[PDB]
Amino acid sequence: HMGDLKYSLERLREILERLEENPSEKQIVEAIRAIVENNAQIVEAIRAIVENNAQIVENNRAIIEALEAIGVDQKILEEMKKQLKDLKRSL
Amino acid sequence: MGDLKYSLERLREILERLEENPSEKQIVEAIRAIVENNAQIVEAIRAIVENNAQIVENNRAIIEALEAIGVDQKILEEMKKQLKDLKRSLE
Amino acid sequence: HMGDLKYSLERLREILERLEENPSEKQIVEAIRAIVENNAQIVEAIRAIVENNAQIVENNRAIIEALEAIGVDQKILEEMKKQLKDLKRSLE
Amino acid sequence: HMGDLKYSLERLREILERLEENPSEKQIVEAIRAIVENNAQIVEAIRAIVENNAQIVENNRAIIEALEAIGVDQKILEEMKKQLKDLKRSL
Amino acid sequence: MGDLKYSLERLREILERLEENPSEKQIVEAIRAIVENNAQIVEAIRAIVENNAQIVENNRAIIEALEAIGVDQKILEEMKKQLKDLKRSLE
Amino acid sequence: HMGDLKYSLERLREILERLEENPSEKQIVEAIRAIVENNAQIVEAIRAIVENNAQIVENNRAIIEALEAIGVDQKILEEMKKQLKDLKRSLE
């Protein structure tokens, strides 16, 4: 959409220079039509950005779940410590 | 986002009404609608920027945790010498 | 910039009041010019948000690449497990 | 057992000096009895060492199992990479 | 270990036989049995030492893996600057 | 030492042949002396194996202490998860 944004805006500026040269009701209306079409594209882009942000957060969420599991669980960790307590006793 | 989609719907309706019976009253009406739509675009953008800021700080915490996921070089240093010791007595 | 956004919008509202107070072709055109200038700044702010999102995704990509290497390589794991097997055989 | 070893051996050396002073069939037999009792204790100690070694290997085995799980599984890891491929595409 | 327990059983039997009807033939017999028991103690010890050597080398591999379990300081260095970058553009 | 073991045993076998060849009270006593000397070296070798086992257990103890800290502290994990929650709330 960033392409349509750049050009939807370039189109907009052309009409504006035009409008400022030969102001008329038709040119004003034409300029407003162009504005509306540019806002429609701004809205579309924003809707996409907000969607990208949502996916980013889901990826970040998965990253934390991974971090959550990187350690050694306290169930096996507890097993090894007792094993060591035992060995130290016998020894 | 909800407000955006509708302030854009409201904007498109005036535009065709303007294009139907154009008048100074309608042009001004349409401009007021544009301004209201732009103010809502601006709020959305500000929210997106706030979300980006919070996203970047979460990424920072993720990296802080990655830094600490390994085993300390102090503790790792003690074990190697322990190993060095053993391998000497043993031989 | 977020500031230039805030003010190209405040400027825009000022003209709109003027326009509604004393409507005229000159004021209408002036309001349209202000609109285009505000749209230009909306577009630039959007352009930067898209830039920032791409860098964020790149950073996320590095984070995952680091998570992939946090484990112990399966070449060392393979060697240790074999050692454990041999030991268990000799001791028994 | 290391205590009984040290003293079972000290006892042994006493008889030996004794034996070497007044050699006799009774002292020889007495010395052999002492030897046998010392070997019995050496065997007991060895049996314990071999048991300690067995427990050590079991602990080492658990340590490797832990190392085996410290990473992030290739099932979630695969999920995040696709999530990123998706994001990169849309974006 | 099996051989140990029995060369010790064999040794104890001669001892009581020696103590029953002591003779130079029996004393020499008992000494031969002792020597055979000691040779078997020595083999056991040598095996235990071999096991200790293999144990120590497994521990070395365990520590080598612990060293590599973290995230490289090179990769970790790249991400922080990435974060530094973002936080600058963003603000 | 493992070497002094090997040789106090070879020495021991030599006397035993002598003893069996020409038995005598002097040779018997001499064989017993050799035995005690071999037992003394068995005991020392055992004493070192017990020493080495204790250091091995100590090293194993450090390895487990390092495994306990390989995870990400639950204080950082707590903070990140909260951040994720807030973000999900603002974005929605």
Author numbering:
A (entry chain B), D (entry chain B): 3 to 93
B (entry chain C), E (entry chain C): 4 to 94
C (entry chain A), F (entry chain A): 3 to 94
Quote the passages of the study that discuss this structure, keeping the authors' original sentences.
Inspired by class I viral fusion proteins, such as influenza hemagglutinin, we chose homotrimeric helical bundles as the fundamental architecture. We decided on a design scheme with two divergent conformations containing a constant six-helix bundle “base” and a variable portion with three inner helices and three “flipping” helices. In the compact “short” state (∼66 Å height), the flipping helices fold back to interact with the inner helices; in the extended “long” state (∼100 Å height), they extend to form interactions with each other.
Crystal structures were determined for all potential bistable candidates (XAX_GGDQ, XXA_GVDQ, XAA_GGHN, and XAA_GVDQ), and we chose to focus on XAA_GVDQ because of the presence of a bound calcium. Detailed NMR and crystallographic characterizations of design XAA_GVDQ, described in the following paragraphs, suggest that this sequence may indeed populate both short and long states. In the absence of calcium, the 3D CM-CMHM NOESY and residual dipolar couplings (RDCs) were consistent with the short state.
